[PDB]
């Protein structure tokens, strides 16, 4: 079923984006005075922070490219999670039809 493949595909893709985002953030932030997003372990925690849109404020980019990377993370995360919500709807809508005969 498409909605399930998509969900899954969306999860593997998000994990890729997170990892690539941790890498790209450090590359972008290092070199900028006062920057804090400069070691991979925390950067990875930051990407998870961003994609889930929780945004604590303990870490965030300050360079143009860092922020640009941050926007791809947010958007991939929002889109990905929004797709799970959508696939859960197709499951419910499908099951609610069965329960009515159709």
């Amino acid at each position: 079923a498409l909605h399930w493949r998509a969900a899954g595909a969306a999860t593997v893709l998000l994990v890729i984006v997170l990892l690539a985002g941790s890498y790209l953030a450090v590359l972008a932030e290092r070199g900028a005075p006062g920057a804090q997003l400069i070691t991979y372990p925390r950067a990875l925690w930051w990407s998870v922070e961003t994609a889930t849109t929780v945004g604590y404020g303990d870490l965030c980019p300050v360079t143009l490219w860092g922020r640009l990377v941050a926007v791809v993370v947010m958007v991939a995360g929002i889109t990905s999670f929004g797709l799970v919500t959508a696939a859960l709807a197709t499951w419910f809508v499908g099951r609610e039809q069965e329960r009515r005969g159709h």
Epitope: R30, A32, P33, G34, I38
Partner: antibody, heavy 118, light 108 residues
């Protein structure tokens, strides 16, 4: 085994330029950064800059005059520091170190003693 | 850019005694401080990372503690092999920076 190998010494004439090397062995990750640290006799450690080999980007210390230019050779696992127009101020021991992107210098090289004399 | 203050610059302690090295940051940096040892003629060698984490191949004698702006490197029961220069290094904010250093000194 010796993770970072550096030449023992380099002699340079005021104004001339030298190119120091740092050969790495052992585990190498795409998340590695090579650092260069300058130490004058009797004094402390001074960070010069860093290079991310797997990508090739370099950042430098903004407070001190920029006399360095970092490059790296992915194939031979060698990091290079290009010092130009050296003066007596630039004579010192230059160490290279490897950081795994977690902020601390895991291993340092024996360091190359540079001397700027005529 | 973060300034790491190391004072006193020299420390004199007697054989077997406990010694403590101080490192203060000009702003809060969590536990992003690392310690290096450097003997006469040798290159620096990581002693403690992240203010208090052990490194393999280093006498259980060495420990560290602190968080925020005040950090300590302690040697329980000093001994001649520990005579050297000690530096702290921070990785909280770019660029990484080093302390000016503290020399250890034994009184026999």
């Amino acid at each position: 085994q010796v993770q970072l190998q550096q030449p023992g010494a380099e002699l340079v004439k005021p104004g001339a330029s030298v190119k120091l090397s740092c050969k790495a062995s052992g585990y190498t990750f795409t998340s590695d950064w090579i650092h260069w640290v300058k130490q004058r006799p009797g004094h402390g450690l001074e960070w010069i800059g860093e290079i991310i080999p797997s990508y090739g980007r370099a950042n430098y210390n903004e407070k001190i005059q920029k006399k360095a230019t970092l490059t790296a050779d992915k194939s031979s696992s060698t990091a290079f520091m290009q010092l130009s127009s050296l003066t007596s101020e630039d004579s010192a021991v230059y160490y290279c170190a490897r950081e795994r992107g977690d902020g601390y210098f895991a291993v340092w090289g024996a360091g190359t003693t540079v001397t700027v004399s005529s | 850019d973060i300034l790491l203050t190391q004072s006193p610059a020299i420390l004199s302690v007697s054989p077997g005694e406990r010694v403590s090295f101080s490192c203060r940051a000009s702003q809060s940096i969590g536990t992003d401080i690392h310690w290096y040892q450097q003997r006469t003629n040798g290159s620096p060698r990581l002693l403690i990372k992240y203010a208090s984490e052990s490194i393999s191949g280093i006498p259980s004698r060495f420990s560290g503690s602190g968080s925020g702006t005040d950090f300590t490197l302690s040697i329980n029961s000093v001994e001649s092999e520990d005579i050297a220069n000690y530096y702290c290094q921070q990785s909280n904010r770019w660029p990484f920076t080093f302390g000016s250093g503290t020399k250890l000194e034994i009184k026999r």
